[PDB]
Design a protein around this ligand. Structure first.
Ligand SMILES: Cc1cc2nc3c(=O)[nH]c(=O)nc-3n(C[C@H](O)[C@H](O)[C@H](O)COP(=O)(O)O)c2cc1C
Ligand SMILES: Cc1cc2nc3c(=O)[nH]c(=O)nc-3n(C[C@H](O)[C@H](O)[C@H](O)COP(=O)(O)O)c2cc1C
Lengths: 312, 312
């Protein structure tokens, strides 16, 4: 039995990694992810300069998941580049870096700095097109003209295979429009579906008050809320972008959800809210649970069922 | 305490009604809604000609809500107009009709027929801009140019106060854009937030198969999945459209959820998945539970706390 994944020139021990933003902001965070049983890890979505993010409280755990408006707190691109170049143990597992400049000009500058490190170390880029908690900045993925600009400029500046973190789409027309843009950029090798369901609102009935401070309580939803949306996006892009990989992100708490993501077409599976709740020990549990499901169904590899969801 | 709502010249006994599509397709359905303790009712989203809708299975109840791809099965506009004109007991409660033509032309033809019945009986129009389960028909509400056309032509053709059923939005820029369109049409007196979270996917791990037949398993999500999205949309439009009412729809299972909707700014509160689960007895329960919360908090009327959610 094997959870191994062969993509992007690497052998991943298993399909699991952290979702960008969870357990990956500091050196200590990244150490714990590297020491975990995860198949990979991704750094916090970074900007050209450091950010401390939004005021508190900006995170609230829910029965059915989480709401957050973190506001992209990060140590700046130079920190994560230095981590990728000097600190990270590539013998343990491959490294992704998430980059989320607040303009195309910022992104271009950032990805240019990554080029030499990708060439030297093999660090992988995930371009974030769906940061929903920065006041005054719309999610790039919801504007297909802006998305096309970003992909053109980053393709030009970076010039190596990279991936994109997409916001969730809720309309067949949007899947079609999104795929049409993505399919025009051959350097986009993977699509991560999905980021948080943006701009939800949670109110405490007792004090009649919102539970987070930023943006009048509006924040991104994660966890059990997002699983059906996540599976739909994974499967939609799996079918619409056959020349690209799809990574699943959203609502993974168990091997069962991981199995569903992979069945829908996911190559790798990212874990956000559940990891925030449980800590990096979750990866050991997820490996065991996924292996259990496969044993019960008589599958030896992930390849036996990846993307083999049945329709009626 | 009083649950009464006084809007559009009508007295509503309480803020509760069915969500369009649930318990409102047939004459018997509408009878049961009229007999219930609900403050109002709305007819199934109808088309110019009858429709039998999508093939089976097209509905699946979930632990956390529902997925459906009904495909607007309805008896045609003539049936609902006849119900509104001849059958409905207006002494029991006011009636809304939902109209969901698959083109602006169809919608215009339908609303023209309603005009004399509105004038005579006081039937209220909810124009559906968010039908997500018709193959080849995108949700109108996600195209602001198309939305503007619909509101223009329907405003002209109907010429009386009406409301709109909106799809959920997930970006602040979209709230701004939607509100800019809506605020140009003074005849739009209410906004219903929200329709289903469109195009989710549920997969059964046992048989590795999607749970509904239409559109490769893709269907609208309702129930516990949608509450934070619903509250966000209600509050966003409550603040952006001060010349209009907002109706809340999504994730109502209890008086507590109803309270949150009203706190967010809802005038009426619609019940979909929970009503499908429980039957029209739910309306008696909802009245009791909301009265209890208001008694506990010392609120004499809904107007004491409507839209008075606190931010930090
Ligand atoms: C605290 C927190 C921080 C996050 N930070 C980022 C981030 O920096 N970049 C990003 O692309 N997504 C970020 N996300 C979104 C997650 O990567 C993920 O897409 C989302 O939480 C859905 O997965 P889940 O259901 O497992 O939580 C963050 C989510 C949380 C809860
Ligand atoms: C079986 C079913 C049929 C529906 N039919 C319609 C419809 O005809 N028109 C409409 O605007 N919404 C329709 N909806 C959406 C609901 O009106 C409502 O917006 C959605 O279910 C969210 O509310 P809930 O969380 O209480 O279910 C339907 C939903 C379900 C579950």
């Amino acid at each position: 039995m094997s959870l191994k994944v062969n993509i992007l020139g690497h052998e991943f021990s298993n399909p699991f990694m952290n979702a960008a933003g969870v357990l990956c902001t500091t050196e200590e965070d990244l150490r714990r992810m590297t020491e975990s049983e995860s198949g990979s890890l991704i750094g916090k979505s970074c900007t050209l300069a450091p950010r401390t993010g939004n005021p508190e409280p900006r995170y609230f755990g829910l029965p059915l998941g989480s709401i957050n408006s973190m506001g992209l707190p990060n140590l700046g691109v130079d920190f994560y580049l230095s981590y990728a170049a000097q600190t990270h143990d590539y013998s343990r597992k491959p490294l992704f870096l998430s980059m989320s400049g607040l303009s195309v000009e910022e992104s271009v500058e950032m990805v240019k700095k990554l080029v030499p490190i990708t060439k030297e170390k093999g660090t992988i880029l995930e371009l974030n097109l769906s940061a929903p908690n920065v006041p005054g900045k719309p999610q790039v993925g919801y504007d297909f003209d802006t998305t096309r600009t970003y992909l053109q400029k980053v393709s030009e500046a970076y010039g190596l295979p990279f991936g994109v973190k997409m916001p969730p789409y809720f309309d067949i027309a949007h899947f079609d429009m999104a795929a049409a843009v993505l399919n025009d950029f051959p350097l986009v090798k993977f699509i991560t579906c999905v980021n948080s369901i943006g701009n939800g609102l949670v109110i405490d009935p007792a004090n009649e008050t919102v539970v987070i401070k930023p943006k009048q309580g509006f924040g991104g939803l994660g966890g059990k809320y997002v699983l059906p949306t996540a599976l739909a996006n994974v499967n939609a892009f799996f079918r619409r972008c056959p020349d690209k990989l799809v990574f699943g992100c959203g609502g993974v708490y168990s091997g069962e959800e991981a199995f569903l993501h992979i069945l829908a077409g996911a190559s790798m599976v990212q874990v956000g809210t559940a990891l925030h709740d449980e800590g990096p020990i979750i990866f050991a549990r997820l490996n065991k649970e996924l292996q259990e499901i496969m044993t019960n169904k008589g599958y030896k590899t992930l390849d036996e069922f990846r993307g083999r969801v049945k329709t009626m």
